[PDB]
Design a protein around this ligand. Structure first.
Ligand SMILES: Nc1nc2c(ncn2[C@@H]2O[C@H](COP(=O)(O)OP(=O)(O)O)[C@@H](O)[C@H]2O)c(=O)[nH]1
Ligand SMILES: [Mg+2]
Ligand SMILES: [Mg+2]
Length: 255
């Protein structure tokens, strides 16, 4: 078989289960994530000679490391075997989905944005510009509906097209300001010789923000301890910048 492994990421209640079901039908099964009792759901479908293995991640509002659901989702995204990620966004209620998307884009993984429930969005009379989304996010964007079937085949096409690509299309460089960017550069330089399994920019962001995993690992690697005030301060600056970018994307792409 010609296998493509795809993770479905998204906030709770965005339409992940429905999209999963629409794509896999009855070809799905459940188990547990390793070492925990938390359920893992996987499914399969075939498209143009390819076999797509879909894995639904726990719903996550953000990708921190202070709850088992975020630990499972983020561990998989960072350390798992997905060839690409579909970020399932609620088209009617996009803001938190887009925030989560930015976090994942900084991991430098292949991501397709699936704006689902597009049939519901239409009814509200809202106008969503797919071109503006692709421009501001730098990734493929597909409008989908699990009710009407809109976009489902286009999504399958983009999955297989994107999986074949040698690199990621996107490259999400959000300017966090002089002071944060300076510390990022210093951290990257400090770790230049380390064999990190994730890009140094993302690592630096999480370390500076006092992430339970990355801050601890950073210190083990020789980075200095940071005061609680600095960790909170960086975490806040970074989140605030992400939120303002989301707000701008929404202003530009939604009407
Ligand atoms: N109209 C419409 N409703 C949807 C669509 N996808 C999901 N929903 C509804 O959104 C709600 C949450 O969907 P679900 O798939 O369970 O979301 P999950 O919590 O992310 O797995 C349910 O009421 C679904 O019926 C869609 O494409 N169109
Ligand atoms: Mg749900
Ligand atoms: Mg909804």
């Amino acid at each position: 078989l010609h296998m493509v492994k795809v993770a479905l990421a998204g906030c709770p209640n965005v339409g992940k289960t429905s999209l999963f079901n629409a794509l896999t039908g009855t070809k799905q099964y459940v188990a547990n994530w390793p070492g925990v009792t938390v359920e893992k759901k996987e499914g399969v479908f075939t498209y143009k000679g390819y076999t797509i293995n879909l894995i639904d991640l726990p719903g996550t509002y953000s990708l921190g490391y202070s709850s088992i659901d975020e630990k499972i989702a983020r561990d998989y995204l960072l350390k798992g075997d997905a060839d690409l990620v579909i970020l399932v966004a609620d088209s009617v209620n996009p803001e938190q989905s887009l925030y989560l998307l930015l976090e994942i884009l900084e991991m430098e993984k292949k991501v397709i944005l699936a704006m689902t429930a597009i049939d519901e969005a239409k009814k509200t009379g809202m106008k969503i510009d797919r071109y503006e989304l692709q421009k501001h996010l730098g990734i493929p964007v597909v409008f989908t509906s699990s009710v009407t079937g809109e976009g489902l085949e286009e999504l399958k096409e983009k999955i297989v097209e994107y999986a074949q690509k040698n690199t990621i299309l996107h490259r999400m460089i959000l300017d966090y300001g002089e002071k944060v960017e300076s510390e990022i550069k210093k951290v990257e330089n400090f770790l230049r010789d380390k064999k990190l399994r994730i890009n140094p920019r993302y690592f630096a962001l999480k370390y500076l923000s006092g992430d339970p995993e990355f801050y601890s690992e950073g210190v083990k690697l020789g980075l200095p301890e940071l005061s609680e005030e600095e960790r909170i301060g960086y975490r806040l600056l970074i989140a605030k910048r992400k939120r303002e970018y989301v707000e701008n994307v929404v202003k530009e792409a939604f009407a």
